[PDB]
Amino acid sequence: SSQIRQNYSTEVEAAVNRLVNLYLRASYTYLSLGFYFDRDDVALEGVCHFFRELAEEKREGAERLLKMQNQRGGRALFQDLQKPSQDEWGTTLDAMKAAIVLEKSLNQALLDLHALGSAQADPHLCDFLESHFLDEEVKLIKKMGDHLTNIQRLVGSQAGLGEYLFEHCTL
Amino acid sequence: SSQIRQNYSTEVEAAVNRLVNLYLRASYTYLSLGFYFDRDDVALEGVCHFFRELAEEKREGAERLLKMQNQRGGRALFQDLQKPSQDEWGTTLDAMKAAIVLEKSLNQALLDLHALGSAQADPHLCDFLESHFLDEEVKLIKKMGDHLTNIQRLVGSQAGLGEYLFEHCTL
Amino acid sequence: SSQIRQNYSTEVEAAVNRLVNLYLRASYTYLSLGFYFDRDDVALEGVCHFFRELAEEKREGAERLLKMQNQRGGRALFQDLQKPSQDEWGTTLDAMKAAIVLEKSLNQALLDLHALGSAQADPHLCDFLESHFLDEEVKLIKKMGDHLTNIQRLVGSQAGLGEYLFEHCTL
Amino acid sequence: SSQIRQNYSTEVEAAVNRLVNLYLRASYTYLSLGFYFDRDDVALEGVCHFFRELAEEKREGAERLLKMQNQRGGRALFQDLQKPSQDEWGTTLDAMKAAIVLEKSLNQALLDLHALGSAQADPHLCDFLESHFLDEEVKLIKKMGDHLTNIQRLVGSQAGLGEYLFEHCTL
Ligand SMILES: [Au+]
Ligand SMILES: [Au+]
Ligand SMILES: [Au+]
Ligand SMILES: [Au+]
Ligand SMILES: [Au+]
Ligand SMILES: [Au+]
Ligand SMILES: [Au+]
Ligand SMILES: [Au+]
Ligand SMILES: [Au+]
Ligand SMILES: [Au+]
Ligand SMILES: [Au+]
Ligand SMILES: [Au+]
Ligand SMILES: [Au+]
Ligand SMILES: [Au+]
Ligand SMILES: [Au+]
Ligand SMILES: [Au+]
Ligand SMILES: [Au+]
Ligand SMILES: [Au+]
Ligand SMILES: [Au+]
Ligand SMILES: [Au+]
Ligand SMILES: [Au+]
Ligand SMILES: [Au+]
Ligand SMILES: [Au+]
Ligand SMILES: [Au+]
Ligand SMILES: [Au+]
Ligand SMILES: [Au+]
Ligand SMILES: [Au+]
Ligand SMILES: [Au+]
Ligand SMILES: [Au+]
Ligand SMILES: [Au+]
Ligand SMILES: [Au+]
Ligand SMILES: [Au+]
């Protein structure tokens, strides 16, 4: 059973298991994104590598949650990992948009679990999320927003392309 | 506009801009303090260096807030930086007293923004302040209180001066 | 008071204090420019870094002036730092144009203070400006003019973009 | 005779010879100051070393002027070096006051020679003084003013002594 569990509600335990599922599903979505850009008829290896690295980060996030589940004396329970929402991911722009949607949904789930932990007076959980997940997600979303802007600029116009080249190759 | 902003209230955005102003104003006060002690008719270079280093720390605090503003998808807005409250800063004791007043006012502003973030259920903001600012301010205020005590002891009496020398040159 | 002041007119002392203000205001303008380009909806990090580095250079210029003020036995007096002329800075081209306007205004202020020092027969001041500021400003303005030309070329046309790429990636 | 002399007035040549004399006399005054503080009944070796180092700097200043005299095709002419104005130099405070008087008189002589060079349209001379002497004198006078303030503070009072110790042994 558990000799260790203290101040760890069944509501948080359940929500932690759900968040693990969401992180693993995110990892799986990114695996699909990465191999799509590795297709010979797409062939954007930088984009492939970006998404494959994100698959690894999301997996690592799930494993940290699972480690924490056991540290608190909760019981990891795994569900079906639903296949990604698309089989083909369109352009770099389409993919980066789908990625930011995905991250904002993980972010919201983190914030929801944080609010639950707060309601349950579970400061360990709250700190765990703050320390390992909330700032990581904020940083990643800012980087993806940056990328979305640059992709839009580059695909949009002569002026846009110009500004990118000056910044990248001069500054 | 912003593709990234999530769970980031207009109230916090505004308060962050105000706190940047207060940190920059603090930095400017410390620049003035440092150059006052560099005057040939004051000539306390250790005191000058202490305040100039604080000017840099307060600037760095503002820049971290501005970075965070952008990471959250808020919009940095800058105001007039009001000149420091004094043109001449009196003795080392007067200056260290003015410094602790200034830090306690920054501290209170941090605590006020923390309470706002808490009311707004913005755990990212709360953690950001805790991790980068609240303990830094507590440590600095304790160091300034230490200094105030030693300055008072040294300027006050034979017994005071004695105790300082034993501690400094023997212990 | 001052045991050291020699050949240092009240007119130069005052003008030095004003120039410190202008350099600090320039630094503040560049802080605003840098964080604008760090926005997720602008996202030109090279441009951000260029302006943030200029903020630091302008701050260092003010500190050197303040050091010189004290070395001559003048009294540093600080005024309100007026907020930058814009909250949003437009394109890279708009920003680099605003930057060169700003530098030419600092340059003219340097030349005006130089003429004053010359009228006042203050060769120390004249040399200080020549040695630490006039050539620095000339070099920076030439670099910004270079940048303005390249930005215009890159945003302007196929021929322009072509010439830039050949120069950058071949030569 | 001189195959090299160009744009080098007899007025500047003469004034350069006089300035060499003043620098050598300053060096001699500092030699006397240094050995006075080496007396067993005075015994302030730090003060001795400060003045002996200044004797060397003033000698080096004269030698640089003499080198410049020859580089311009002028003729070094040496006069009697008058013995220092005092045989005994009183307290550290008295000595540092006499030192700043001496430096201000060298400084004024530099500024006078600068004005002559300017009147004579001799930019080489003007630059030579600016580059090797005017800023050196400004820095040294600021350091002596600093010292005068600290000596006065230390000899004056409990509060003064206190402030010095805090700055020196804490900051
Ligand atoms: Au890849
Ligand atoms: Au929480
Ligand atoms: Au919490
Ligand atoms: Au909590
Ligand atoms: Au908490
Ligand atoms: Au929390
Ligand atoms: Au590039
Ligand atoms: Au390129
Ligand atoms: Au200093
Ligand atoms: Au908070
Ligand atoms: Au909180
Ligand atoms: Au919070
Ligand atoms: Au919190
Ligand atoms: Au908090
Ligand atoms: Au000591
Ligand atoms: Au001591
Ligand atoms: Au940057
Ligand atoms: Au000048
Ligand atoms: Au001049
Ligand atoms: Au001049
Ligand atoms: Au000049
Ligand atoms: Au000049
Ligand atoms: Au290139
Ligand atoms: Au290229
Ligand atoms: Au000595
Ligand atoms: Au001159
Ligand atoms: Au001149
Ligand atoms: Au000249
Ligand atoms: Au000149
Ligand atoms: Au000159
Ligand atoms: Au000491
Ligand atoms: Au001591």
Domain ranges of chain B: 10-170
CATH architecture of A10-170: Up-down Bundle (1.20)
Please tell me whether residue B85 adopts helix, strand or coil conformation: coil
CB D54 within 8 A of CB D22: no
Give me the amino acid identity at B101.
V
Instruction: List the beta bridge partners of residue C81.
Output: B81
In this complex, the residue of D149, D161, D167 whose CB is nearest that of residue B92 is D167
Evaluate whether C67 touches B31 at the Cβ level (below 8 Å): no
**Å from CA of D118 to ligand 21 middle:** 8
Find chains touching chain B: ≥3 CB pairs under 8 Å. Answer: A, C, D
Instruction: Assign C24 to helix, strand or coil.
Output: helix
| Amino acid found at C98 | A
- Separation in Å, CA of A63 to nearest CA in chain C: 30
Q: Which one-letter amino acid corresponds to residue B93?
A: L
Residues in chain C within 8 Å Cβ distance of A145:
40-41, 43
Distance between CA atoms of residues A156 and A146, nearest Å: 15
Q: Which ligand is nearest to the CA of A116?
A: 2
Instruction: Tell me the helix, strand and coil percentages in chain C, rounded to 5.
Output: 75, 0, 25
B42–D162: do the CB atoms touch at under 8 Å? no
CB-based contact C3 D135, cutoff 8 Å: no
User: In chain D, what are the helix, strand and coil shares in percent, each to the nearest 5?
Assistant: 75, 0, 25
The helix or strand, by DSSP H or E, that contains position D126, with its residue range, turns out to be helix D123-129
Rounded CA-CA distance C88/C35 in Å is 10
Q: Which residue shows structure tokens 């995905």? A: A102
Distance from CA of B13 to the nearest CA of D (A): 38
A125 neighbors A113 (Cβ within 8 angstroms): yes
Rounded to 5 degrees, what angle do the CA atoms D18, D21, D26 make?
130
Contacts of B131 (CB under 8 A, 6+ apart): none
Q: How far apart are CA C108 and CA C129, in angstroms?
A: 12
Looking at beta carbons, which residues of chain B come within 8 Å of A104? 6
Q: How many residues does chain A have?
A: 171
Say whether A166 and C151 touch across the interface (CB within 8 A): yes
Identify how the structure was determined. X-ray
CB contact (8 A) between residue C4 and residue D131: no
For residue B70, give both structure tokens. 């952008």
B chain contacts of residue A101, beta-carbon cutoff 8 Å: none
For A95-126, the DSSP string reads HHHHHHHHHHHHHHHHHHHHHHHHHTT-HHHH
Query: Which residues, including other chains, have CB under 8 Å from residue D74's CB and lie 6 or more apart?
Result: D5, D8, D12, D13, D16, D17
Phi-psi region of B43 (alpha: psi -120 to 50; beta: other; left: phi over 0): left
Residues facing A128 on adjacent strands: none
Q: Does the beta-carbon distance from B50 to D171 stay under 8 Å? A: yes
DSSP code, position C144 = H
Smallest CA-to-CA distance from A115 within A6, A42, A11, A28 is with A11
User: Residue C88 in 3-state DSSP?
Assistant: coil
At position A73, the amino acid (one-letter code) is G
